[PDB]
Amino acid sequence: LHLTQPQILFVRKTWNHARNQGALEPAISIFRNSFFKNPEIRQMIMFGTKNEGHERLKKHAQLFTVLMDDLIANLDSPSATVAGLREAGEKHVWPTRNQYGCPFHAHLLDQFATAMIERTLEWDRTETTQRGWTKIVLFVTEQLKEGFQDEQKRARR
Ligand code: HEM
Ligand SMILES: [Pr+3]
Ligand SMILES: [Pr+3]
Ligand SMILES: [Pr+3]
Numbered sequence: 800l801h802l803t804q805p806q807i808l809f810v811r812k813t814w815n816h817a818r819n820q821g822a823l824e825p826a827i828s829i830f831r832n833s834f835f836k837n838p839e840i841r842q843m844i845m846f847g848t849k850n851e852g853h854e855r856l857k858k859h860a861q862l863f864t865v866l867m868d869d870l871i872a873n874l875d876s877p878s879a880t881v882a883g884l885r886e887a888g889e890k891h892v893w894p895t896r897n898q899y900g901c902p903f904h905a906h907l908l909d910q911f912a913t914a915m916i917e918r919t920l921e922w923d924r925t926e927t928t929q930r931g932w933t934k935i936v937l938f939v940t941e942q943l944k945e946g947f948q949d950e951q952k953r954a955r956r
Contacts, residue, residue, distance in 0.1 A: 800938050803927075806934070813932075816922055817922040818868075823857065823861060825922065826859075826863040828918055829915045830914075833914035836913055843899045866880055884939060887943060888943040888945065894955075905944045905948055909944075919932040
């Protein structure tokens with residue numbers, strides 16, 4: 800991660816503003832936008848009964864909120880959140896690939912990145928400071944991808 804200080808200030812101001820939307824926001828809105836980018840993501844996260852699906856989305860938002868909160872508070876050295884992100888990615892390796900209807904692949908996280916970047920634009924902006932969000936989202940989804948791909952490559956087929 801290489802954010803400039805003006806980028807760090809802008810990201811923190813907009814993030815804390817976004818968190819004002821609710822306990823699990825903006826995480827929930829980010830997941831919902833990924834559902835729009837790719838409805839298969841929704842089919843997977845909402846797999847099962849109405850309750851099960853909603854609980855899974857809630858838990859996803861809860862954990863992502865914690866990881867993001869920690870990352871943003873620690874933009875100076877985020878090794879802890881790096882491990883956490885790789886671990887989260889790792890959790891998407893399932894012996895039966897279509898256990899949840901559609902298999903997980905790294906491309907889903909690229910779509911998630913697009914969804915998240917779109918949301919950041921909704922949260923005194925300049926192109927240079929806004930690029931702080933692009934850096935953060937790329938970092939986050941890259942660590943998720945590495946966690947998943949390293950784990951999936953190692954698993955039996
Ligand atoms: C990119 C699209 C994503 C899809 C389609 C997806 C879907 C799923 C599915 C189907 C499971 C297995 C069912 C379950 O354990 O609840 C799971 C597990 C998990 N996911 Fe995701 N997820 C996505 C992104 C993320 C992200 C960004 C995070 C970051 C926090 C995350 C964190 C986790 C964790 C921690 C588990 C293990 C849950 C547990 O053991 O209770 N996922 N995910
Ligand atoms: Pr592990
Ligand atoms: Pr298999
Ligand atoms: Pr592992």
